[PDB]
Design a protein around this ligand. Sequence first.
Ligand SMILES: CS(=O)(=O)c1ccc(-c2cnc(NCc3cccc4c3CCO4)n3cnnc23)cc1
Length: 350
Amino acid sequence: FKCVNSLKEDHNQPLFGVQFNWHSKEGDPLVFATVGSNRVTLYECHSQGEIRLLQSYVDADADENFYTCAWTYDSNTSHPLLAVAGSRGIIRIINPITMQCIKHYVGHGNAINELKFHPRDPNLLLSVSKDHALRLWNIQTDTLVAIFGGVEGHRDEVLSADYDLLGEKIMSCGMDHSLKLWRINSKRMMNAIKESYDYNPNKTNRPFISQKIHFPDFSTRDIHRNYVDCVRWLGDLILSKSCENAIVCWKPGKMEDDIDKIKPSESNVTILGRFDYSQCDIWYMRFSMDFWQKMLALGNQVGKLYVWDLECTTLTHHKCGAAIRQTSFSRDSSILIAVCDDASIWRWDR
Ligand SMILES: CS(=O)(=O)c1ccc(-c2cnc(NCc3cccc4c3CCO4)n3cnnc23)cc1
C-alpha cells in the first residue's frame, strides 16, 4: 500500500466512522461515507488517487454527534441507502443520491454506538446502544422486531456487534467486558421477522409487538479485561479487541466444540491466536476486514495503520499523527481509507 491522497473536513471534529459502499457494481462509482460532528459526507474514489466530494448531510441538530454508519440497498430497486446514528440515539436513513433523510427511528434510550445490516436481508438493521441493549429493525415495514437485553443481557454500554456470515446469529460486546451471542435463527426470531413483514399500521389499530429477548445464547468475560469495543466474526471464530494492544481470535467452548452445539451454560472459551500491536490503548478504536476477509486493518492513536494478511505491515505518513478511529477497504481491497481525530481522511492504494 502507498498513500496517494489525504484531505481534511472543514468541521475539524473527529471522524468516528467510515464505510465504503460494497453494493455498487464493477465500473460503477467507488464511494465511501464518513461520519463525524453532526455530518455525513460522501466521496468518490477516482483514478490517480483523486477523491471527489459528492454530497454532505448536515443534521438539523448541531449537538448531534454521529458515531456510526452502514450501507444497504432497497430490496425492490437495488438503489443504495445509508443509515447513520450517534449521540442522540436516533437512526436516520439517508437517500445517498439526494443526501436527504428519508426516514428516522427513535427508541434507544441513549446513544447508538454501531449499526450493522443483516448480510442476507437488506431490510434488517441492528443497532447497539449505551442503553445496554441491541435492537433489530425492519426498515421496509418500519418495525422494531426485537430488543436484545434486560436481566441477563449487557450490564453496561454496548459498543459493537456483528452478524455471522449468513446472519443466523449476532455477537455483541461492550463496557461490561463481555461478549454475548444471540441466535436469530430460533423459531421465535424467525417468526418475529416473518410477522414484521406482514405488519402495516394502516390495516390494524394495534401496535406491532417486538420480541423482548432477555437471555443470550452464550456469554464470556474471559477474553479481555477492559471495555470490548470491536467484534467481528471470522467464519465460526471471533475476532475482538479491547484497549489492551491486541485483537484476540477465539471461539466459545473447547477446541472441538461446534458453534451450533454451544449451550447458554458453556463456561469455556478457546484462544486461537493474537494480533499484537502498539499505541492503541485508548477506548473507541475499530478494526475492519475487507469483503473477502483476507485482510485485517487497525489504526492506532498516533496515526499508524496496521495491516495483516489473514491468508503485519505498518503504513505511516509524516503528516498523519492523529488517532485513526476506523478504516474501510474498497470491495476489491485495492483501496484502504483511514479517518482521524483531526478530521483527516487518508487514502492508501495497493
Ligand atoms: C476525541 S474525544 O473527545 O476524546 C472522543 C473520543 C471518542 C468518542 C467516541 C467515539 N465513538 C463512540 N462510539 C462509536 C464507537 C464505538 C466503539 C468503537 C469505536 C467507535 C468509533 C471508533 O471506534 N463514542 C461513544 N461515546 N463516545 C464516543 C468521543 C469523543
